[PDB]
Design a protein around this ligand. Structure first.
Ligand SMILES: CC(C)(COP(=O)(O)OP(=O)(O)OC[C@H]1O[C@@H](n2cnc3c(N)ncnc32)[C@H](O)[C@@H]1OP(=O)(O)O)[C@@H](O)C(=O)NCCC(=O)NCCS
Ligand SMILES: O=C([O-])CC(=O)C(=O)O
Ligand SMILES: O=C([O-])CC(=O)C(=O)O
Ligand SMILES: O=C([O-])CC(=O)C(=O)O
Lengths: 435, 435
């Protein structure tokens, strides 16, 4: 056997700690300014937090340990079938800063299958949800409810040494990762909780495949979607630290809440319309537009629907970003996935998304409120699930929730390993800013 | 009939918006520096966020709209019985910036009783929790599950103008405030869910009274505790924006998650040992000390127990603070509550807390590690509940959760009224700080 993930982590921990010691010697160095805009504009442009596994360039998009999406697509191991990079390999990369071998990822995928089972009480809890409860509300709750399984909480409560916080944090992160797909599947399939909640995973298969199996999309006849799902989950894993869900996870984590509670809070932030609930909102908005404009439509019909949306005092979902000033390479990667599949390009809903990406930026620029008129990844993700038969847009952000566990759980482990403190900015009132 | 809370808010909204417009003209003005310490040290000392209702004074401790705790104790309306300021009146003050009349508060207390009822599903959900599930995990979950009752989420989902965000946000905040005590009581009393979950509240009684009734502590014989609970909840409502629970609520709120989801995340942050658990930790530490030193003890017995605690590499809980450099006026207010109650002063556990506050600061200073050797509010809060028969310290953070809804829900309403954007800072890795 090659080194397992935990062993791989331990090898890189001392080097990171030494680097932390060196960065700390320069604590007093000025790296920027705070202005009034930063305070009133939700900390926009303010480099104020540490995130190790990914950094976002506004012009060029995301890099994971200095590697582009395309670099990751080429370098990360693939599944037993298919052409797309595995999220579990992305997780490995994020955590260790090193690309895993295919063997190492297979061993890791196998561990994730083994640890996906849920305690009976989580099944009972999910069964208590009324049918109408929003799916992200369900997902967030069930993840927090898994804090009964937390080794970190129990170890912290028993007395535990600061240097060894990361191990329980890591154990919990792997546990949450293994379980969350199944939880997510229970949200998708409320009538089939007893079967879905206990059904065995194929032990020889990757995370995305098993997530699809639990969704009712397993086997060879669904292998194209397995590839989409793999790509999708790996693309949404991490997008630096400033995004609401990552940040919330870190923030709640910094008070030494365990990873289930911490990432529950992530999920609550991800449920925000301005954040990941945009994936849902994009496709609902696109379907509404389709109903209004019909099968045969002009550019103006699309232009008018966007302008009407803006004039209603609503956002155009799937366009804009707190950091990016160009089209999101995650968005482009999903469009390129579509580009080689003629049945997807023929899907009228996808065509509408494509057409909308050609018109929305001009309209958004004419409106002139947004810093970034370009599409983000949420513009394209939902239409792709729709194409493969996931046609209830209320569930779309749930799949994002599974993905977005990856980066933030990585960061929590590092936060505990480094001994990073509680997150505690200073606030001030408007009268205080005026003085 | 005098203006209701919503009407009182509406009168002050345009003035706040005008001030916001003026502060915005000076967006480009530099108010501070970012250093490396800020990035690695959890944004400590970094003025980066807006919080309107409370500001922390280094000499004087927290002030609510410029008013001290003692100012609030004198000016805020009291209940039909008792001498302590009502939390609902604190909420009013936080929100409106003005002290309510007793009439106005009675009308508001009546609305809170009327809206405390829960959907049947919340009862079923709470019933599903295993006995061992941590109480803060229970509280956080149930609050998030109340997002089925969210007007903001349903209005947002139906299409809603940005200008109209605050009213649904306000409606939800009042709804959450009315309901949370009952939820909190269900966590305290897992065997009494059917009774506590449905019991009608006296609409002519204040929030804290009804919370006590649901706790099993109603009626004249418990009126002292009603006063404690009132004081306690009003003191813990708000403590700037930088604290984890407030911040988390704001952060998740900024992506336009409703107040149930947003404050659920607050509660998850409050569940963190470094945030919400201190009250519990103090009393366990005090009871440990009491078991060793006994009912009759000398200063030295206490001195030795503190020195032993510090030499074991542990904190003396309830002393220190991220901001405060003086004894906390919240702490002093709780000690002064005890001062007029001879049975409390006679309680050996309270005497030990008092005695410890006379000795701990010197010892902490001699040890020399801490910046702030003075007691914070957590030093005193737990012993007082213990005196009135709440002797499971595990549930003390739950009562904090009820209190800490106040300030952050206020801030959310203001965030939506002002049109504040998503909170989305820039992050950076250690390698980026090194270069
Ligand atoms: C992503 C987003 C939340 C970023 O927020 P931000 O960084 O604060 O946005 P900006 O700095 O560009 O905001 C400046 C103004 O343009 C507006 N704006 C930005 N993007 C917009 C969009 N897609 N549609 C309408 N208005 C937008 C903002 O609301 C703000 O106006 P306001 O003062 O009237 O609120 C925002 O651009 C957006 O897209 N909102 C919709 C959510 C979405 O589609 N995707 C989220 C997943 S990345
Ligand atoms: O149409 C919806 O809103 C989703 C729905 O009925 C369900 O499956 O519960
Ligand atoms: O980066 C952001 O601000 C939000 C986002 O799209 C992501 O998390 O990928
Ligand atoms: O706990 C804290 O962050 C505050 C403190 O006592 C210190 O810095 O010495």
């Amino acid at each position: 056997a090659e080194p397992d993930l935990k062993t791989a982590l331990k090898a890189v921990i001392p080097a990171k700690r030494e680097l932390f010691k060196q960065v700390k010697e320069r604590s007093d160095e000025v790296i920027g300014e705070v202005k009034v805009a930063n305070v009133i504009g939700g900390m926009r442009g303010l480099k104020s937090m540490l995130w190790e596994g990914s950094v976002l360039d506004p012009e060029e998009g995301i890099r994971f340990h200095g590697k582009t999406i395309k670099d990751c697509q080429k370098e990360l191991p693939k599944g037993t079938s298919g052409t797309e990079m595995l999220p579990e390999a992305m997780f490995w990369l994020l955590l260790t800063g090193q690309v895993p071998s295919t063997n190492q990822v297979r061993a890791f995928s196998r561990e994730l299958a083994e640890q996906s089972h849920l305690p009976q009480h989580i099944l009972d809890l999910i069964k208590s949800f009324p049918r109408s409860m929003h799916p992200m509300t369900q997902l967030s709750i069930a993840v927090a409810a898994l804090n009964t399984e937390s080794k970190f909480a129990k170890a912290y409560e028993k007395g535990l040494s600061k240097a060894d916080y990361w191990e329980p944090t890591f154990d919990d992160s792997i546990s949450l990762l293994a379980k969350i797909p199944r939880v997510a599947a229970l949200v998708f399939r409320p009538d089939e909780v007893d079967q879905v909640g206990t059904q065995a995973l194929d032990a020889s298969q990757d995370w995305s495949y098993n997530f699809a199996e639990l969704l009712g999309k397993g086997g060879k006849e669904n292998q194209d979607f397995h590839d989409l799902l793999r790509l999708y989950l790996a693309l949404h894993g991490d997008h630096e630290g400033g995004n609401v869900s990552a940040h919330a996870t870190h923030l709640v984590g910094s008070a030494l809440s365990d990873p289930f509670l911490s990432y529950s809070a992530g999920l609550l932030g991800l449920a925000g319309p301005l954040h990941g609930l945009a994936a849902q909102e994009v496709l609902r908005w696109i379907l509404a537009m389709q109903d209004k404009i019909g099968t045969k439509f002009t550019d103006d019909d699309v232009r008018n629907y966007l302008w009407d949306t803006l004039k209603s005092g609503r956002v155009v979902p799937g366009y804009g970003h707190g950091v990016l000033r160009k089209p999101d390479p995650r968005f482009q990667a999903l469009m390129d996935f579509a580009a080689t599949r003629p049945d997807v390009l023929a899907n009228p809903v996808f065509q509408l998304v494509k057409k909308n990406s050609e018109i929305a930026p001009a309209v958004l620029t004419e409106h002139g409120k947004t810093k970034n008129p370009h599409p983000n990844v949420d513009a394209a993700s939902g239409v792709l699930f729709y194409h493969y038969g996931f046609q209830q847009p209320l569930y779309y952000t749930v799949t994002f929730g599974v993905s977005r566990a990856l980066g933030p759980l990585v960061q929590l482990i590092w936060d505990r390993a480094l001994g990073l403190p509680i997150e505690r900015p200073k606030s001030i009132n408007l009268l205080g800013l005026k003085k």
